[PDB]
């Protein structure tokens, strides 16, 4: 028969837009950014099933802003908890912008 | 002499067939595209089956060739094997070596890999007759077969309270669809076997640990920024 | 330069002989222990070596090796007679299950002669010997002579191994499957082989 | 019961990684990043630490996955940096003994792209000390200093109960790894090393491996001695007599 | 059996280490009188082989 | 000058496709679907219709890429069903002429898994004719048949 | 090759241009963007394949699903569109 | 070769190895002058041999 | 060191076998073709690696031989791995006549181009016509049908000599052809002014020629 | 090598007092003439001339 069609959802693009707008301030003020605190504060704004995607996208946006000078110290970072049910994150603080 | 050798060979063959049959069951109902199962097909070569039967029951017809002290046992085995299937040729190699070949049980077995594809029955696994994902999945299946066999082999040389580690890789994992990845995760989990997979972000498996990589230039030198996530689910 | 393993392979003492044989069209089965092992070990390079001649080195699914020339073959080609394929398909039929109990792998010329006469149609038999022939003793004697001749040709191809004595009794090798029919899921070999022979 | 586990992977002074440690998952670890980020580099590190044999090690590109040897370059040299480099694994046995195994890597100077490799193993390390700390000195500069094997041996020997073993041949290294349950089979000889590497690299690139398929019985069936040694002993009297006659 | 349990088992079974397992031991009773060619002390055990 | 373009690709009686027509795009056309769906098969049909030289065609897996193997089987036969098969391309020339190239494929009965190819070309076909309908006959209640 | 045949060809014909790429999933977003701009600047047609829809906002896309059905196989094709 | 290399993607071993043959076109004006010298050089070969 | 060509084969021999000319040449050589000076490519190739080829073929129990006239050919031994065959007496008659034609300065002005009729005329001028006719048919007595039959047999044998590389037909005309130096092998029984019997014995001992 | 072959004795003998070009070198390329190390075969490559 004749060909049917199906459409995509843009929810994740919208999510990326909110996160990038919310995060732009850190660069502009060159404020030190800690992934642990930011993830813990930002996951509280969405329900549990969506946390994983939010974490991924937030990390994608955050890593573009500068580097963490501690990485050259030879000292590994710890696994910080960011919500209940037991999710963890590992990252040094971002200092060099 | 004679019958007892046949019995030890038969029991060794039987034990190998049974162990393979046990390994075989763990791979039932694995979904990889249109492939739905994998097997290791084990069979006995005819030219050796008849030899084994003759050595079992017609020994009085050939005892001259066995008790002749001018030649050794392995030579006797080689000469009997040439007496049967006379069309076989020998490549100017010592009969001693052919005898020792007949003494090794593995030479009696024929081995194949088969897959239960789609509407069809069991087919021999040929790379050219499969899609990409089906080929990758079948490869993983055979690899876990090998690992299980090797662990069973060595345990008689290891401490009673030691269980070796098991780990395998997969590069360019984006080539597999979600259903195939679910199947692969189920297999490795049931086999207590660790996995490390690389994908250019196209796949986001919820279970396990994830590492985000970004390469940059810093003080005129290449540097990799790394972030990690885990615990979801 | 030349790949190291290819140089090793063709440096082996067994190569000249096998080369000679293969160029002739002989088929290497599992019977020839050393030759078969040699091919198994060095297939990846021998295939490339013979591709330079526009000739293909094929391993049949049953296990035997043989060469197939292309249209642009560098090796002079030659072609079998109709009676040759008739006999070949007969031998493929004789590679049966009751064969094991009937002959224990060793046949005689008479088995094949009588099978050929019984199973084929008279018209193609006359076409084989000569169209002017009609059911005469001399024609049957000539057909026997031709059967022995083509059987020796096939022995050259390696299809059939004569038992080492002057009498004409032989055994059939697995490579005879090359004459065989196409196999489809669940089809009985006897029926399909007969269907082609008809 | 309680199968052992790989716990972590550490890179020091590799191309793009001055000092990095990955904490491996109990079931699945996923590496993710754009093209050229360095994923395959990490797997190269893992396997080279596992099988430190320069005759087998060949990191061909994923495209052209199945071709011949081709070039004389094995693709490893370019992943190192000037100076001293390390790759180490951290393992926990069923006994819960912490063992650290690894190799030291260095670019051999010359026209050609060659590498020098030396295995080593450490046992009894406290749970409080990480590999990166062992292998680097926190000098006043912005970036630490990677310390060679001499400094490392001196630093480790000072510890109480810690043993540092440095191997001269790959065979010894594999023997120790097997005894501690890090690998499923003890690599008697070079042929065993080749088959083990075949397994690993076939898993790495993926697909129905040609070599595994050819020699299926050689891989899946153990070799049994019982059928043989009886007849070697019975045959002995004749063998000696024949040799004496010759 | 592994090397760790080997000494234990060898001590446990003692002289009977090299006996034969035979699940009935009454089927041998008729055969037994014929045993003139055997080790001076033969051990038999009953159980599932 | 206006460069020529490929309008569409048509498959008849392939493995999994009875009669399907893909309409190509001016710049990029993407095929998606789980493993074994039939994407590589579509690629193979296109290239076969472009270069019918049976000596060259050799469809290896994506794995084992670049290995000169001389495999026993070129991998084309299995992608065809019994009976007659087609593969055709519709092209708009720079002269704005519609031309339909293609090949008729057919399995060869016999132990060897061989294939037969016969190229053909059509010019001047009216713009209203679709290849899918041109290559089939409507027999029965919407149960069309393919025609040699 | 197109430049070489400028002499033989008639003045008014420019030959068609088309290439393939299987397992496009091996490329990341930036790489595919580069590839698309290259091919469009050269009036080059492309046909690419991937298990997942890697190009949602450019060109046309088809989705293939295989169904086992009455002891044979049948492929169902449906189109996809950038926005809904 | 061109289409197959595109299909499987990547640096095709065969293409790069013979890049001259694939990229550089042939010229008939060069041949027309070289015909005479070809005759001459053939003759010289003859003599040499 | 290990995995090094020299372990198994001389470099020059491997270099020769890897050449693009080898398969053609090999195929031809095995088929009995003689190689002269005119086919430069082949000849030059032969010259460059002579000893390697000789050594190679030796494996087969066959001699790669170089005649004084500069032409190469294959001579199998009694233990040969490759079959050996002999030419027919009519082939010899045409061979010795082609040899005399090559030498003849009287016809050198033709620049090597000869016609089947000229060959036939020379042959009948020298040999016993009516006695030679016995080979065409046992009843021949000079009839024209039999004379045409003889001419057709000559036409056929000459075509066989072309496959052996002893004569080359013109590109567009098949009634005319050119000779090559390979024909001098037909003079092997007389190139030395000695006792014919001893020469013949020497030749059969060397494997060059058989009686009938 | 093109300069060597192009420029001839009588006029360019005054040019030939340079260390890089001489007549004999054309025959020296006879060594290169016999066999260059070509690898893949199509159409017909043969020699330096
Ligand atoms: N031997 C080498 N010599 C030089 N550069 C190299 C070498 N190996 C890798 N590189 C470079 O190192 C960087 C990382 O390469 P690598 O193969 O690890 O990438 P990747 O993240 O695995 O990429 P992808 O998954 O797309 O294959 C790339 O720039 C690559 O060019
Ligand atoms: N020669 C063949 N013989 C039999 N079945 C085949 C053959 N070639 C392909 N198939 C089957 O046809 C189906 C389609 O395969 P194909 O490779 O076209 O799929 P795909 O969607 O491109 O998959 P992938 O992305 O994993 O490569 C699969 O089931 C494959 O097993
Ligand atoms: Mg990579
Ligand atoms: Mg596919």
mmCIF file of N, CA and C in Angstrom, chain B residues 113 125-127 135-136 138-140 142-143 146, chain D residues 65-66 195 197-216 219, chain F residues 61 63-64:
data_model
loop_
_atom_site.group_PDB
_atom_site.id
_atom_site.type_symbol
_atom_site.label_atom_id
_atom_site.label_comp_id
_atom_site.label_asym_id
_atom_site.label_seq_id
_atom_site.Cartn_x
_atom_site.Cartn_y
_atom_site.Cartn_z
ATOM 1 N N UNK B 113 29.500 -25.498 13.889
ATOM 2 C CA UNK B 113 28.677 -24.489 14.546
ATOM 3 C C UNK B 113 27.413 -24.308 13.722
ATOM 4 N N UNK B 125 26.820 -22.111 10.358
ATOM 5 C CA UNK B 125 27.055 -20.677 10.474
ATOM 6 C C UNK B 125 28.132 -20.257 9.483
ATOM 7 N N UNK B 126 27.726 -19.572 8.418
ATOM 8 C CA UNK B 126 28.646 -18.959 7.471
ATOM 9 C C UNK B 126 28.543 -17.443 7.573
ATOM 10 N N UNK B 127 29.695 -16.779 7.647
ATOM 11 C CA UNK B 127 29.710 -15.330 7.803
ATOM 12 C C UNK B 127 28.974 -14.642 6.661
ATOM 13 N N UNK B 135 26.323 -11.773 12.984
ATOM 14 C CA UNK B 135 27.694 -12.265 13.032
ATOM 15 C C UNK B 135 28.354 -11.915 14.358
ATOM 16 N N UNK B 136 28.187 -10.675 14.818
ATOM 17 C CA UNK B 136 28.801 -10.280 16.085
ATOM 18 C C UNK B 136 28.255 -11.132 17.231
ATOM 19 N N UNK B 138 26.897 -14.140 17.162
ATOM 20 C CA UNK B 138 27.375 -15.512 17.084
ATOM 21 C C UNK B 138 28.816 -15.610 17.568
ATOM 22 N N UNK B 139 29.644 -14.626 17.209
ATOM 23 C CA UNK B 139 31.015 -14.627 17.692
ATOM 24 C C UNK B 139 31.089 -14.614 19.206
ATOM 25 N N UNK B 140 30.317 -13.728 19.837
ATOM 26 C CA UNK B 140 30.298 -13.707 21.298
ATOM 27 C C UNK B 140 29.885 -15.063 21.865
ATOM 28 N N UNK B 142 30.286 -18.125 20.601
ATOM 29 C CA UNK B 142 31.364 -19.113 20.537
ATOM 30 C C UNK B 142 32.469 -18.767 21.529
ATOM 31 N N UNK B 143 32.728 -17.477 21.740
ATOM 32 C CA UNK B 143 33.783 -17.105 22.677
ATOM 33 C C UNK B 143 33.450 -17.553 24.093
ATOM 34 N N UNK B 146 34.234 -21.133 24.487
ATOM 35 C CA UNK B 146 35.651 -21.425 24.701
ATOM 36 C C UNK B 146 36.032 -21.155 26.150
ATOM 37 N N UNK D 65 39.570 -4.646 8.991
ATOM 38 C CA UNK D 65 39.647 -5.417 10.228
ATOM 39 C C UNK D 65 40.332 -6.767 10.064
ATOM 40 N N UNK D 66 40.366 -7.322 8.855
ATOM 41 C CA UNK D 66 40.748 -8.713 8.692
ATOM 42 C C UNK D 66 41.909 -8.964 7.754
ATOM 43 N N UNK D 195 46.993 -18.470 21.029
ATOM 44 C CA UNK D 195 45.562 -18.767 21.070
ATOM 45 C C UNK D 195 44.820 -17.831 22.024
ATOM 46 N N UNK D 197 45.618 -14.767 22.801
ATOM 47 C CA UNK D 197 45.518 -13.477 22.130
ATOM 48 C C UNK D 197 44.490 -13.514 21.014
ATOM 49 N N UNK D 198 44.426 -14.620 20.277
ATOM 50 C CA UNK D 198 43.382 -14.773 19.273
ATOM 51 C C UNK D 198 42.017 -14.574 19.898
ATOM 52 N N UNK D 199 41.785 -15.212 21.043
ATOM 53 C CA UNK D 199 40.503 -15.063 21.721
ATOM 54 C C UNK D 199 40.225 -13.597 22.028
ATOM 55 N N UNK D 200 41.186 -12.924 22.663
ATOM 56 C CA UNK D 200 40.951 -11.544 23.092
ATOM 57 C C UNK D 200 40.677 -10.643 21.895
ATOM 58 N N UNK D 201 41.534 -10.702 20.877
ATOM 59 C CA UNK D 201 41.408 -9.766 19.766
ATOM 60 C C UNK D 201 40.181 -10.070 18.916
ATOM 61 N N UNK D 202 39.823 -11.348 18.771
ATOM 62 C CA UNK D 202 38.575 -11.687 18.104
ATOM 63 C C UNK D 202 37.392 -11.087 18.843
ATOM 64 N N UNK D 203 37.409 -11.137 20.176
ATOM 65 C CA UNK D 203 36.344 -10.472 20.916
ATOM 66 C C UNK D 203 36.376 -8.970 20.680
ATOM 67 N N UNK D 204 37.573 -8.392 20.604
ATOM 68 C CA UNK D 204 37.696 -6.943 20.490
ATOM 69 C C UNK D 204 37.079 -6.438 19.193
ATOM 70 N N UNK D 205 37.486 -7.006 18.055
ATOM 71 C CA UNK D 205 36.953 -6.506 16.788
ATOM 72 C C UNK D 205 35.541 -7.002 16.497
ATOM 73 N N UNK D 206 35.194 -8.203 16.934
ATOM 74 C CA UNK D 206 33.861 -8.727 16.735
ATOM 75 C C UNK D 206 33.704 -9.454 15.410
ATOM 76 N N UNK D 207 32.717 -10.336 15.373
ATOM 77 C CA UNK D 207 32.426 -11.154 14.214
ATOM 78 C C UNK D 207 32.884 -12.588 14.411
ATOM 79 N N UNK D 208 32.361 -13.460 13.552
ATOM 80 C CA UNK D 208 32.738 -14.871 13.589
ATOM 81 C C UNK D 208 34.196 -14.969 13.154
ATOM 82 N N UNK D 209 35.083 -15.254 14.101
ATOM 83 C CA UNK D 209 36.508 -15.282 13.807
ATOM 84 C C UNK D 209 36.832 -16.422 12.855
ATOM 85 N N UNK D 210 37.603 -16.119 11.811
ATOM 86 C CA UNK D 210 38.012 -17.157 10.872
ATOM 87 C C UNK D 210 38.908 -18.185 11.550
ATOM 88 N N UNK D 211 39.900 -17.716 12.307
ATOM 89 C CA UNK D 211 40.864 -18.630 12.909
ATOM 90 C C UNK D 211 40.200 -19.540 13.931
ATOM 91 N N UNK D 212 39.315 -18.992 14.762
ATOM 92 C CA UNK D 212 38.599 -19.830 15.720
ATOM 93 C C UNK D 212 37.793 -20.886 14.981
ATOM 94 N N UNK D 213 37.167 -20.496 13.873
ATOM 95 C CA UNK D 213 36.315 -21.419 13.137
ATOM 96 C C UNK D 213 37.126 -22.548 12.511
ATOM 97 N N UNK D 214 38.315 -22.239 11.988
ATOM 98 C CA UNK D 214 39.127 -23.277 11.359
ATOM 99 C C UNK D 214 39.466 -24.388 12.347
ATOM 100 N N UNK D 215 40.012 -24.024 13.510
ATOM 101 C CA UNK D 215 40.589 -24.978 14.451
ATOM 102 C C UNK D 215 39.673 -25.276 15.632
ATOM 103 N N UNK D 216 38.369 -25.372 15.396
ATOM 104 C CA UNK D 216 37.381 -25.470 16.465
ATOM 105 C C UNK D 216 37.712 -26.559 17.484
ATOM 106 N N UNK D 219 40.398 -25.646 20.020
ATOM 107 C CA UNK D 219 40.009 -24.710 21.065
ATOM 108 C C UNK D 219 39.062 -25.338 22.082
ATOM 109 N N UNK F 61 30.709 -9.695 4.565
ATOM 110 C CA UNK F 61 30.188 -9.038 5.751
ATOM 111 C C UNK F 61 30.927 -7.726 5.973
ATOM 112 N N UNK F 63 32.071 -6.816 8.952
ATOM 113 C CA UNK F 63 33.241 -7.422 9.555
ATOM 114 C C UNK F 63 33.948 -8.286 8.522
ATOM 115 N N UNK F 64 35.248 -8.477 8.724
ATOM 116 C CA UNK F 64 36.125 -9.059 7.718
ATOM 117 C C UNK F 64 36.273 -8.149 6.508
#
